[PDB]
Paper text:
In this study, we have characterized recombinant AfERG10A as a functional acetyl-CoA acetyltransferase catalyzing both synthetic and degradative reactions. Unexpectedly, AfERG10A localizes to the mitochondria in A. fumigatus, as shown by C-terminal green fluorescent protein (GFP) tag fusion. Both knockout and inducible promoter strategies demonstrate that Aferg10A is essential for the survival of A. fumigatus. AfERG10A consists of three domains, an N-terminal domain (residues Glu36 to Asn153 and Asn287 to Arg302), a C-terminal domain (residues Ala312 to Asp433), and a loop domain (residues Met154 to Met286).
Author numbering:
A (entry chain C), B (entry chain D): 36 to 433
C (entry chain A): 32 to 433
D (entry chain B): 35 to 433
Amino acid sequence: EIQEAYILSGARTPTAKFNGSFVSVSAPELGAVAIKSAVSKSGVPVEKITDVYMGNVLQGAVGQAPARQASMFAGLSPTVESMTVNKVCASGLKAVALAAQNIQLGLAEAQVAGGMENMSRVPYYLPRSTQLPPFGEIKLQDGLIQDGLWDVYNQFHMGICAEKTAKKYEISREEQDQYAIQSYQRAQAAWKENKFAEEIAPVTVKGKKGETVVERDEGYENLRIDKMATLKPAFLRDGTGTVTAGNASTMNDGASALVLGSKAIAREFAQGNRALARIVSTADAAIDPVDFPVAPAKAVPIALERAGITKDQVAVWEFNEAFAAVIKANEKILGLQNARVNPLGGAISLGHALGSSGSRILVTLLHQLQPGEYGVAAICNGGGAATAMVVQKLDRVD
Amino acid sequence: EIQEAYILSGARTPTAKFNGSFVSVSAPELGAVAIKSAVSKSGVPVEKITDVYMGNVLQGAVGQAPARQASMFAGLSPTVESMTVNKVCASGLKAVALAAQNIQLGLAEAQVAGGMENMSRVPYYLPRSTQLPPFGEIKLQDGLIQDGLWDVYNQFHMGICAEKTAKKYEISREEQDQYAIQSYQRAQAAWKENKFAEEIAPVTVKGKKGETVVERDEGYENLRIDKMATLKPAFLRDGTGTVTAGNASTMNDGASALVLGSKAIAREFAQGNRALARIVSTADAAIDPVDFPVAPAKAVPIALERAGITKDQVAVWEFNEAFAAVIKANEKILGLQNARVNPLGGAISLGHALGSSGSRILVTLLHQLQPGEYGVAAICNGGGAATAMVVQKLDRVD
Amino acid sequence: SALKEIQEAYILSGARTPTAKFNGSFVSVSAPELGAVAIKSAVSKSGVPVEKITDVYMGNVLQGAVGQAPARQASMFAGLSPTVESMTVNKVCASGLKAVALAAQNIQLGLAEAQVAGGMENMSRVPYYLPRSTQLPPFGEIKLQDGLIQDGLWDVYNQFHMGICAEKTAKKYEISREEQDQYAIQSYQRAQAAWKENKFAEEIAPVTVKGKKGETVVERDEGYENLRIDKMATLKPAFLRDGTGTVTAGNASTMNDGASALVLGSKAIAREFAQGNRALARIVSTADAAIDPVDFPVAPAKAVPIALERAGITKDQVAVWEFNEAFAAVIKANEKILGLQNARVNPLGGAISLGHALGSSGSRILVTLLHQLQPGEYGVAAICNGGGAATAMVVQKLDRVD
Amino acid sequence: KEIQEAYILSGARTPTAKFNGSFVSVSAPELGAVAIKSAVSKSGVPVEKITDVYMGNVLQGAVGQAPARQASMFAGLSPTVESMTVNKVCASGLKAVALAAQNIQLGLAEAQVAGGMENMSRVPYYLPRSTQLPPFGEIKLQDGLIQDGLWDVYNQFHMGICAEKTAKKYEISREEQDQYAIQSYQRAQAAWKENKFAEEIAPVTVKGKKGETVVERDEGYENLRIDKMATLKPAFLRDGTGTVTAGNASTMNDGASALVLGSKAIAREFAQGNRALARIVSTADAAIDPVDFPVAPAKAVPIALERAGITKDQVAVWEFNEAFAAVIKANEKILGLQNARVNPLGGAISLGHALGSSGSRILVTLLHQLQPGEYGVAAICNGGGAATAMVVQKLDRVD
Ligand SMILES: CC(C)(COP(=O)(O)OP(=O)(O)OC[C@H]1O[C@@H](n2cnc3c(N)ncnc32)[C@H](O)[C@@H]1OP(=O)(O)O)[C@@H](O)C(=O)NCCC(=O)NCCS
Ligand SMILES: CC(C)(COP(=O)(O)OP(=O)(O)OC[C@H]1O[C@@H](n2cnc3c(N)ncnc32)[C@H](O)[C@@H]1OP(=O)(O)O)[C@@H](O)C(=O)NCCC(=O)NCCS
Ligand SMILES: CC(C)(COP(=O)(O)OP(=O)(O)OC[C@H]1O[C@@H](n2cnc3c(N)ncnc32)[C@H](O)[C@@H]1OP(=O)(O)O)[C@@H](O)C(=O)NCCC(=O)NCCS
Ligand SMILES: CC(C)(COP(=O)(O)OP(=O)(O)OC[C@H]1O[C@@H](n2cnc3c(N)ncnc32)[C@H](O)[C@@H]1OP(=O)(O)O)[C@@H](O)C(=O)NCCC(=O)NCCS
């Protein structure tokens, strides 16, 4: 009765800087680029793909039905069904977990799933006339802040949440910054050898003169060891701050996508796929909103149990580097310091376009795997939660 | 080992009019009132409920993680996972189907699911500094139009889609107004017989001068039979037009929620439950974006084949009345013109809070079925899709 | 042209529109459209042929979104020829009076024989400010200032409302909550009484507002029947919430929409066309003075003596005083300093009860002052203005010039 | 009781900065304060004698309360100094000087400060209050620069359109306009190579997060590109008949300017030998139909010449604001000033046009070009159909 789901491909766009190369390109347009490549590399006749699920946290001004736009701009048939998913930062992974379910229940044989975000293109919000005062100062919220990084209950940024955790586990400035430098170092190492060449789909942004062709993550080069310890705290300006702009994730523009199928679909069209893998298990989990940084420490045991697997059978972990504070706490709680986490860099140097990051880390994870090895992809999200996915890399199906 | 999933309760707030009673109540607050009533009427201990899935189409300035807010403002534990869903007008019904998938897969035993929408509180968009011109006039889009009711591909209103449907299937102005007059009469007859007292959870509005319990839907009493045939078409003003404000659905604020159950949970805690039912099947289907009004005609026959029944075995049909033209088209294509279709009114008279509408017709449907009878909830969404659910009403499970 | 000796200037006519409430009857009517209504009526009542009027000077504090050259619009909307010259004046609340004094200098120098001066203000229509792309942050909360506060009611140097300036003056000159309230109650009474006898009928130019399906004619001031005597002593201070607060919404002026205008002329023009004019009077003197920005409520105490000295008259020779009632605190401090306690200051009400359309107020008080004087009588219009300043004018009511 | 004369004792201007350039963080009143401070220092008059500050400012949105008060106060002038912000559109700065002159003429004052200021970069967009907003649907937000500064109310078009119509009527062709515009740039460059503007310019110290910048040079006079000039699209009329371009029109800029005026007595006791010493002989304002605002200086000049008792041939240097090349070319035809000394060191096309300061900026530039005893004319047109003209006479001493 219940079947399993296979990843056939993975294609993310280059992660652009805030107010950078993708300011002209809507999140769906980025999404379509990531989709068009992923299908191409999967092998499956498109006709077999039936649904497109895409994460998107900030849908303000994106237009009607963001995920639908991705599907249409990708050249997929109006006949394909779609849905825009919002689990804050877990959105991209969750969209893959849900697309999996259509296959696990036999409802479909091929699905497209991932995430997209253009944080440069998020608007400010001007209330309509019945919610404006008759006179006096009006405060306009950015939307990146209000809907993306502002905790509703404690009424403070996600960076304060990261301070309260960095305090509670005795994580210090100098090891947050060491982790950051390492993030950047690993990202530079990786780009020197062009370790993301195969996984990246290049974005042709046209405008005025002719066409740029963007191929390269923006922000990984830009590390300056000297300044790193001089960097002022970014959220906590009371004396005790530790999280800075250098040791936090950056705001970014980009999109990622994966093609999924049944056993039957893989066997018939995707046996020698670069990305090839089996979705072993997934799991969500929630705790108090403040404690969102460790919510991965609660969602990975579950996914692992559901996997029938232990910490020590997992080759490479890919946690989303939302802060250095975060990774380091989750490393100390799961006892993974001496394990292969974010070998090619993370959100601190590779960027963090919200709705995409869940699926982007998976795409990166699938290209660092030897046949038979177990991969984990985990990602915290605001509100107090995470989702983790256990996958296994394969050369073939049977 | 694919499981069955049961609806155990169904609750909704009153549908308030645009710029009316709920201008100060956010969509998650309204969704939280509807969630509180559904968990109470379910009769299942809160601890077995592990996920909240809520539709919300226009998430702008609602705050981080709208569905999570709903879950928390209703007093569900920080430990319950959540996800905000966007399939436009179909979001609430899709949210139900997703919660079902969890039970159907054995990942949970109880879910809550539905939708919320505050169209009054949808903001205007102000692009950030990098997307504003150096000088000259700037046009701020209203979120209702840009993300809610504007087709991305053809660049016109949803009700131009309705017009191009009414032309194709020869549904005249007179036929459209006749159906709208019937919708209002059915809503008035239902409100006069108090047919919604059981499904409605009142809303407590905290003003300055005391409180206000809102218990009545707003809009359904505003019919003037005289003026209905003299209204000016609201979308097509070139003299060919047919869709008016009267024969179309209004913009409203409201929320709806249902508790879902495994067979085991239903048998142990929901015997005799007023709204008890089994989900027999669910289907999504998509076509050309222009043709989103006739997408139910493509989803309904799919959900009936998965349910193993035919059109003739369903006792009550609940199709969202986005426009009168929408219903009359689908009744013609499906041969349901003499069937029991929206007997207690619909969105023309009872309103249309985008992300709640899909699950609101579900709640309304459950209260009109006799034990052993099949019902069908179908709702079209922007982009060219529709979601349909077949349900079998029960008195007890054996 | 020019002239070797300073000539005399006379006011031939005076008109004002009703003073409407903030966000009230004039939301659809721009300050120059309002100015134009007052202007049309003033030239119509003056008896001088329009070809003789050569310049229009109108006061206007908040000019955002009003369009190019606001005083030029009042002129063209009043039907004056395109050859008449114009200028928009900004001396904050003293704008309307200052425009009169400037229009009188043209006649005093012999450069002109007939002028139009006054002021207009539509506080409902002043907008919010959104800075352009280069002055906005890349991200984060944006604060939109309301032009009323940023450009009209906010001190630049002290960074506080004009009502805090009123607060510090009330303390300095020991003006109590009770005196403030008692003054405001009187203003309301004096206005109600004045309105019951139709005292404003001659000076008021009605406004016709084209609304959706049909026209509405406005000829009555809005806000003067809004006194509830018993609530007065209970109102929360509007600006100072630390316990020392004293100024409230009942004892302070309101924000309003209105316009006022006068025709002025040379002796020769007055003799030929305005001998029995209802409003006919001579501008005897003007004076502007300034002190520290926080002490603006008492700047009129500095302007008045200078104006009186330039007129060769004493306090005791002034029949009716018309001081803008910015706050009750302001009027009482100025009565203290000048020893007017037992004088007739604002007999038919003022700003507290009849409103305060900023740039129109200076010429609105003049218009009201000219309709209350008897032949030969000396009148004084004075008005403080933010930044620390005031302007006073002495006039002499006459039946004829010879 | 007898009308007297007014004298100019000193003049300065800040440098004219480019739109969105060096002065985006410096408000018009701060720019004003720099020019007032320099004019007051160079006048040689004790500061207790100056009693009024009249400053032009056209776009007063978000500048704060009483912009001319701010200018006075930021220059360290005392709070007893009276002030007023004047709005005659582009004539604002010249009209302020005339008004200050009137006080001295009527004997109400012995020393005055007058000039103009504008920060076009800092002009804001206008958002209406809740009672003027539609309850739903698209909202259009006007730029103040367009709505209040450059849009004719009666004809509902840009000032550049008014320029096109004066070009048609006076047969000024795209070629004539470009030649005059090129010429303006070359004069400006010539003047900057000879450091002609050093005596009148008051440097602006712009505070920054990473250091202070001292701006002492006009911005935009090197942007001439003769090649490009004839290949430019019409800026305002795009119906195939347009002749006005960004090249041959004035630019938008930020800047200020200021002069100290005085009575004969004050001039004699403290300003003998002052570089900018001159006598205000006459001033005139004039208006006609709004669309004909570009030819309005032609009505104003004759009146000012008549009141000064001089002929057009008796004026050594003419300073007409170069709002567009077409306006200068049309005014030269009407007045017969084809071979006259007109805008010899350049003008608004190359040197910029900070709306409320231009009127007084051309006067400052004029005063530094005149020989002792020579007559000069400053004239500037303004939106709505008007113009202001001032006749001066350069002096070495008063007697
Ligand atoms: C940090 C953040 C808040 C914005 O930072 P910012 O204010 O734009 O910071 P900048 O990029 O200007 O950098 C600040 C300084 O650090 C320096 N800096 C940047 N990257 C650096 C690096 N790798 N090494 C050293 N210094 C660095 C910058 O050069 C700058 O110095 P400068 O001002 O002298 O130029 C945002 O990027 C962010 O990631 N915040 C949280 C993101 C998020 O999603 N939060 C929750 C996730 S669940
Ligand atoms: C209603 C809507 C179409 C815009 O119309 P509107 O301008 O708000 O119209 P209103 O309802 O305010 O009033 C329109 C007129 O019709 C009248 N009217 C409306 N319903 C009526 C009825 N049942 N009987 C009689 N008269 C009625 C009103 O009284 C009014 O008369 P008036 O113009 O003489 O004052 C708007 O809700 C919209 O944008 N579309 C609906 C949302 C939608 O399309 N959703 C579908 C998503 S799939
Ligand atoms: C003072 C000011 C802020 C008042 O704004 P506001 O709060 O909107 O004023 P309100 O509409 O609240 O004034 C009425 C309020 O006080 C009460 N009130 C006001 N005037 C009253 C009176 N004369 N008698 C009794 N009650 C009165 C009203 O009933 C209401 O109280 P409520 O809320 O309990 O019903 C405003 O008028 C202002 O900014 N102007 C003062 C200064 C100024 O305009 N410029 C200075 C000139 S240089
Ligand atoms: C200020 C103004 C110049 C700005 O217009 P703009 O469109 O930004 O023009 P730019 O300065 O960008 O230049 C336009 C083009 O001409 C070019 N150009 C500008 N000045 C030039 C010059 N002197 N020589 C050659 N080419 C020039 C630019 O490089 C650009 O070409 P590009 O497309 O290759 O970049 C003008 O359009 C304007 O609005 N002026 C208002 C007129 C006014 O002040 N009225 C006052 C009435 S009294």
